């Protein structure tokens, strides 16, 4: 019943199947890293991400006089076995917390079904996988075997608090925006969280508040999983399409531009900053991408490789994109079905909706200002649980989000840096 059927320990011996040393397709060289497959199509790599981007392999913090306002560096974070063990257990607990909600179960199901499209063939009559949507797993005999996967949770790069989805691109294809999808690498840490303010006028002001309440890391991970869902279905909105914020004087004086992809992901009132005209534009655009996929599938008459049959892979994608199949076995995109899936991935799976399911306090808008970063430890059940997060039932932390109150539940938070007033 649990999402992760094995309570992995970082030191568990490698078996070459779900506990193994692997290498990722970063078009470069790297020493194998120990990884854990926590669920079908989902892996966790308890390492700082110095792999997805060649220019971001240095965890060393530049001079203190060259540090931005909201950022946090510590080259030693996640370098020891105990830290990696705690990282693995923390990420696992958050997946269980997310999976324990109906919304989380829906999202994770969509993610597992969202296999990156097999669009690596240059011949229309053949269906082929794209190598960058796989990892190379070292087998018991020392040889490498290519395994397709949808999601990888990895530690952050140099800036510890810069969580985000990273994925390998294609020479000609925009995989996260052409309906294809690509394996998503989420830079994330369950060992830190961020403070926010309970009053909207304070939370959205760069000069006020110290970060009284702590964001539940399950919401933070869910946010990235939402992006991952968009990217896996190839419907992420080009980051160049932004809302030149004009609803917050502080954002304006700084000329802050927020991508529509972020507003969509947060949901709630934020999503309304994307006007109906633009909303319809994107819906049509991605509908067209799904149509291109149906056409590509229909042209494929043979499969490349010996991993799966063509009929199986066609069914995989029929299910992923909810395509319609006629007598001849030809695929087509049904407008109704597309709109429904598109809406599920973009309007149902949102940060604001997850807040409702977790019953936690959270920022009310993405258009606010960070207050502080705290060190936390959610592994001990006396600190955080799958079902209550920090707001432990039958304790003084159960009511009024007292568990998230960093002043009341001070033993669970250590402020590492204040951001207020630095902007």
């Amino acid at each position: 019943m649990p999402f992760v059927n094995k309570q992995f320990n970082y030191k568990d011996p490698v078996n070459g199947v779900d506990i193994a040393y692997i290498k990722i397709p970063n078009a470069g060289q790297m020493q194998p890293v120990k990884a854990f497959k926590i669920h079908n199509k989902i892996w966790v790599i308890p390492e700082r991400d110095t792999f997805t981007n060649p220019e971001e392999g240095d965890l060393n913090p530049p001079p203190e006089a060259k540090q931005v306002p909201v950022s946090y560096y510590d080259s030693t974070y996640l370098s020891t076995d105990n830290e990696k063990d705690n990282y693995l257990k923390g990420v696992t607990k958050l997946f269980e917390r997310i999976y324990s909600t109906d919304l989380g179960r829906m999202l994770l199901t969509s993610i597992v079904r969202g296999i990156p499209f097999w669009g690596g063939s240059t011949i229309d009559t053949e269906l082929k996988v794209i190598d960058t949507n796989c990892i190379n797993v070292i087998q018991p005999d020392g040889s490498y075997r290519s395994e397709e996967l949808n999601l990888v949770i990895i530690g952050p790069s140099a800036d510890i608090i810069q969580f985000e989805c990273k994925s390998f691109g294609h020479e000609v294809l925009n995989l996260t925006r052409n309906g294809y999808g690509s394996t998503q690498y989420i830079r994330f840490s369950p060992d830190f969280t961020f403070g926010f303010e309970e009053s909207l006028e304070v939370d959205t002001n760069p000069l006020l508040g110290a970060g009284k309440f702590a964001t539940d890391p399950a919401v933070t991970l869910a946010h990235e999983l939402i992006h991952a869902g968009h990217r896996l279905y190839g419907i992420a909105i080009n980051p160049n399409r932004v809302f030149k914020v004009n609803t917050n004087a502080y954002y304006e004086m700084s000329g802050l531009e927020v991508s529509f992809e972020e507003l969509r992901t947060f949901g709630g009132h934020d999503a309304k900053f994307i006007d109906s005209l633009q909303e319809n534009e994107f819906r049509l655009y991605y509908y067209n991408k799904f149509k291109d996929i149906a056409s590509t599938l229909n042209k494929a008459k043979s499969i490349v490789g010996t991993t799966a049959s063509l009929q199986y892979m066609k069914n995989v994608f029929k299910e992923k994109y909810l395509l319609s199949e006629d007598t001849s076995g030809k695929f087509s995109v049904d407008k109704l079905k597309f709109d429904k899936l598109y809406k599920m991935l973009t309007e149902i799976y949102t940060e604001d909706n997850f807040v409702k399911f977790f019953k936690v306090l959270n920022r009310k808008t993405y258009l606010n200002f960070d207050k502080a970063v705290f060190k936390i430890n959610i592994v001990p059940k006396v600190n955080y649980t799958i079902y209550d997060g920090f707001n432990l039932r039958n304790t003084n932390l159960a009511a009024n989000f007292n568990g998230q109150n960093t002043e009341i539940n001070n033993m669970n938070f250590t402020k590492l840096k204040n951001f207020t007033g630095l902007f």
Partner: peptide
């Protein structure tokens, strides 16, 4: 992406 940069 966790935040806008600020």
């Amino acid at each position: 992406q966790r935040a806008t940069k600020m």
